[PDB]
């Protein structure tokens, strides 16, 4: 999914990222999430849904 300019979208359990925005991965190979949180995403490239 991509969001166009002047638009936004909310995805529950946002991606936990490092200081450079690189997705942090768990020891067992899982993706580091932020449980029970919502994030606002503005116009950018078509990110994937983890």
């Amino acid at each position: 999914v991509t969001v166009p300019p002047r638009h936004y979208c909310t995805v529950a359990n946002p991606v936990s990222r490092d200081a450079q925005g690189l997705v942090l991965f768990d020891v067992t190979g899982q993706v580091r999430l932020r449980h029970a949180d919502l994030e606002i995403r503005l116009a950018q490239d078509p990110f994937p849904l983890y």
Binding site: D26, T28, G29, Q30, H35
Partner: protein, 46 residues
Amino acid sequence: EFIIRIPPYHYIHVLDQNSNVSRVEVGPKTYIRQDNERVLFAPMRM
């Protein structure tokens, strides 16, 4: 029945029948029970 891999962010309880002791196991890991040990119910989200 013997093989029980719980999904990520879940747990199960397996009873040690040789000690009457119950325990919980967490983490996205595959779990195999013993003959004496018996799981009580299927995984539900933690």
